[PDB]
């Protein structure tokens, strides 16, 4: 028997990354009483690994209006992004970086004393017909590193109650509304109950459901599985972005900023990727036209390798004074894990899982959505909000543009703090509920702790990662996808005989890594169902059997429901927004054929 401890707040934020930290002192400054439950220390998250930039139209180099920035985001998304969150993110993009410089983010500076901006791929000028524009606004090659350590320091200026190393288990729902979250103290072994009015989820992606991913070790989907256990849908789970710059074996990442400054991929034959399997734009293109330019190139026997299945990216043409000033982080990362050289000899390259352009469906102001059972229209869940990588605002749509994911955290963490300030009065009585609230999520903690079966936790986790790499690949068809749904159901039925050796409550790291396996099977049994039910080729979802893009029948998102593991998955759809927040301020952009 466990003893529960009760808390009582106004707004509970789950997660302390880049968009959970921005929405934590955004609400504790307005006059509320917040809490920021985290599993790690705040400057340990996955947003410390970001090394690109934050795209903004600040002006400091050449000339740039945010309306050019908006068209480059809709064109690089295959018109699946809602064209009013694009209008809202790029309009509040110059205002959100100047506010980040006043907090104390040490930016690289130019000759007159303004912020330094490099160039990335996809972003042009003069509405797609022009040159490469310089809008990246970046701090050498440690941009995500110097962004947490400023946002965490500013979060200590205002009184925010951080709850470090608390594993959150499930959501608390009474008659179809979220009234708080139940957590688990790792240092002590006590069960806590947080009660609030507006619960905000910023947990992050589910990248660790695959075999070779670039994500962290803790980067599992615990926000998308807490929502799916309550009976609420997830949106666009079949768009997974594959990176073309992942090291063999380990899965680590070299940035595409090296390709933005003159990185050239050299295959075994030494011929350049321009006309064989490549678009007219050489290397500064989307993240999917180059991964398809690599996945079939190593298959056709043109790449380097002992097993002929990798590449290398040349950085030797640059001057030595340009590497050691702009990218010192890659000069030490490829010297340890790859272990040949960075400057005089190139480094191996494999396609790895990078980013997830899906999750909880929200609006442009942060509040989550579901659909009505008979009319098919949207509906707002009362209390549940979401922001960051674990929320599908569809700013990225079908393909995330380069370095738009750090602008995603700053703008849509700032907007979450503003919409609670328009609805919630500071200081309100909480309704009396029964004391058995959350008793169905403590009995799951005890069933996975007193376990005795035939398979261990590290044996079932190898059958899931191996299955998701073979079948849900870069190239998919309707003969291996239907075997990928059939195999992922067979691994979930063997979760009833999982085995756990540690029977303590103080730092049971065998329990915590078993609850992360229960959350991964819920985000992996809906990716395989949704990917085998879209007969189309857009974005990062390329079907071999249906090689044509649809603008008449398949311009709609995909919602999915699944209660627990070993339970059937259903699907419904919702319509994509094609209008703007205001017609006179910016006109809408009509769909054309996408070609770079």
């Amino acid at each position: 028997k466990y003893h529960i401890i009760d808390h009582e707040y106004d707004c509970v934020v789950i997660g302390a990354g880049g968009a959970g930290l921005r929405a934590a002192f955004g609400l504790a400054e307005a006059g509320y009483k917040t809490a920021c439950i985290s599993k790690l220390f705040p400057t340990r998250s996955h947003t410390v690994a970001a090394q690109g930039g934050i795209n903004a139209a600040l002006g400091n180099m050449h000339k740039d209006n945010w309306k050019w920035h908006m068209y480059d985001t809709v064109k690089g998304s295959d018109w699946l992004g809602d064209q009013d969150s694009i209008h809202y993110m790029t309009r509040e993009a110059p205002k959100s970086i100047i506010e980040l410089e006043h907090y104390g983010v040490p930016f690289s500076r130019t000759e007159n004393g303004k912020i330094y901006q490099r160039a990335f791929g996809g972003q042009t000028k003069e509405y797609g017909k022009g040159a490469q524009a310089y809008r990246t606004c970046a701090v050498a090659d440690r941009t995500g590193h110097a962004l947490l350590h400023t946002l965490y320091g500013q979060a200590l200026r205002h009184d925010t109650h951080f709850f470090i190393e608390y594993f959150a288990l499930d959501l608390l729902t009474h008659n179809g509304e979220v009234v708080g979250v139940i957590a688990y103290n790792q240092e002590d072994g006590t069960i806590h109950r947080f009660r609030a009015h507006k619960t905000i989820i910023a947990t992050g992606g589910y990248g660790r459901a695959y075999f070779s991913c670039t994500s962290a070790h803790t980067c599992t989907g615990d926000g998308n599985a807490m929502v799916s256990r309550a009976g609420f849908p997830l949106q666009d789970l079949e768009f997974v972005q594959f990176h073309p710059s992942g090291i063999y074996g380990s899965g680590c990442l070299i940035t595409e900023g090296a390709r933005g400054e003159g990185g050239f991929l050299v295959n075994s034959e030494g011929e350049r990727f321009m006309e064989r399997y490549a678009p007219t734009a050489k290397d500064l293109a989307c993240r999917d036209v180059v991964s398809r330019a690599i996945t079939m190139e190593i298959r056709e026997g043109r790449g380097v390798g002992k097993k002929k299945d990798h590449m290398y990216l040349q950085l030797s043409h640059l001057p030595p004074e340009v590497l050691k000033e702009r990218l010192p982080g890659i000069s030490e990362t490829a010297a340890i894990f790859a272990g040949v050289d960075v400057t005089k000899e190139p480094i191996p390259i494999i396609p790895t899982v990078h980013y997830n352009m899906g999750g909880i469906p929200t609006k442009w102001n942060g509040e989550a959505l579901t659909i009505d059972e008979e009319t098919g229209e949207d509906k707002v869940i009362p209390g549940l909000m979401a922001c960051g990588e674990a929320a599908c605002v569809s700013v990225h749509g079908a393909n995330r543009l380069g370095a738009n994911s750090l602008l995603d955290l700053v703008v849509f963490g700032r907007a979450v703090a503003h919409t609670v300030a328009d609805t919630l009065q500071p200081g309100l009585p909480h309704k009396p509920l029964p004391s058995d609230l959350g008793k169905e999520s403590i009995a799951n903690l005890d069933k996975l702790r007193n376990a005795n079966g035939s398979r261990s936790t590290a044996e079932i986790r190898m059958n899931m990662k191996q299955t998701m790499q073979k079948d849900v690949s870069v190239f998919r068809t309707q003969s291996s996808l239907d075997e990928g749904v059939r195999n992922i159901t067979a691994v979930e039925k063997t979760f009833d005989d999982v085995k756990t050796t540690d029977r303590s409550m103080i730092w049971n790291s065998d329990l915590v890594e078993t609850l992360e396996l229960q959350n991964l099977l819920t985000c992996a049994s809906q990716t395989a169902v949704s990917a085998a039910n879209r007969k189309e080729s857009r974005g990062a979802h390329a079907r071999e059997d249906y090689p044509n893009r649809d603008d008449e029948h398949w311009m709609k998102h995909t919602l999915s429901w699944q209660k627990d593991v070993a339970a059937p998955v259903t699907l419904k759809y919702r319509r994509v927004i094609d209008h703007t927040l205001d017609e006179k301020e910016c006109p809408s952009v009509p769909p054309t054929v996408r070609a770079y």
């Binding site: 925010t160 109650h161 951080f162 470090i164």
Partner: protein, 131 residues
């Protein structure tokens, strides 16, 4: 020595409290850092012009050397008291060992008065037991 009751495990509270610093007390802060460098810049040259000579030092020059060498040996034991006999653990037995260095360094100043007027000097004593 007796030991004051300590914090249970090193810390008391949550990671979002703060360590409130003691106020500015410059006579053991930056001004104590001046006196440790004045005495250490005066025993380095004077010990060099006491190894190059060939006999007893001049009686006015030796008193300057033998009172700068007491400050260099008092400021050392002031740091071995503050590091090991702290006031967290022992309490009032930190300022009792500081008082023992009080009348153990003023009687040691009387010994320099009975060495430069009667005998030849401090460095004359060290040459006498040879080395």
């Amino acid at each position: 020595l007796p030991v004051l009751p300590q914090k249970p495990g090193g810390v008391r509270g949550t990671p979002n409290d703060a360590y409130v610093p003691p106020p500015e007390n410059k006579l053991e802060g930056s001004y104590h850092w001046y006196m440790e460098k004045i005495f250490a810049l005066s025993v380095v040259p004077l010990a060099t012009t006491a190894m190059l000579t060939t006999g007893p030092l001049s009686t006015a020059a030796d008193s300057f050397f033998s009172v700068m060498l007491l400050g260099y040996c008092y400021m050392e034991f002031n740091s071995c008291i503050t590091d090991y006999i702290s006031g967290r653990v022992y309490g009032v037995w930190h300022k009792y060992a500081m008082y023992m260095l009080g009348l153990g360094s003023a009687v040691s100043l009387f010994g320099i008065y009975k060495l430069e007027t009667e005998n030849d000097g401090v460095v004359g004593l060290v040459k006498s037991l040879w080395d």
